[PDB]
Structure 1
């Protein structure tokens, strides 16, 4: 319903991007996620009634990557 761009630092293998996508995509309200390793971003399609970019960033950071919401 909404889309957010999140900068994620230190994504340096495929396995981590899949972990990130796997974990984030399974959160309630998260419809879709695509990570770009080249950009260092995750684009997330989410339901703002349920989840926010700030909580997505927090979830990425609980996985151990520095993150910040871009837009």
Structure 2
């Protein structure tokens, strides 16, 4: 995740260099970005080890107080060859959800693919395909 802050002393520009060198190699910060035309610094951080206040208190003590900041189940994937508009999603996700064993179903045109949580006692993947073929389209199990 991304955050924005202001700094005192970055007016001299070179202040940002010794910050940039140290910030981005650390357990909770993976890269650094600058926005000096906006007047801010832009940090690219991991919320697992750190947070806005913890970052603030870390980076402000890099210098000697010299640069100050202000802040029953299986899952399978399907490929489909009868999707011509986004309305195909609300049609497939709707109609295929009605034939039992289908616990959860999601579909996208971006790759032409669905992901579905099925009951392996009640239904098999090759039956999922057959239902889209019965709807009037074509499906394939990946």
Unaligned runs of 5+ in 2: 1-72
Superposed structure 1 runs of 4+ greater than 3 Å apart: none
1:10 shift after superposition: 2.6
Bigger shift: residues 42-51 or 8-17: 8-17
Aligned residues: 70
SS of aligned partner of 2:131:
helix
Q: Which residue is 1:60 aligned to?
A: 132
Unaligned runs of 5+ in 1: none
RMSD, aligned CA: 1.0
Local SS of the residue matching 1:49: coil
Displacement of 1:22 after TM fit? Answer: 0.7
Alignment TM-score, normalising by the size of structure 1: 0.89
Structure index of larger Rg? 2
User: SS state of the match for residue 16, structure 1?
Assistant: helix
TM-score, normalization by structure 2: 0.47
Aligned-pair distance for 1:56?
0.5
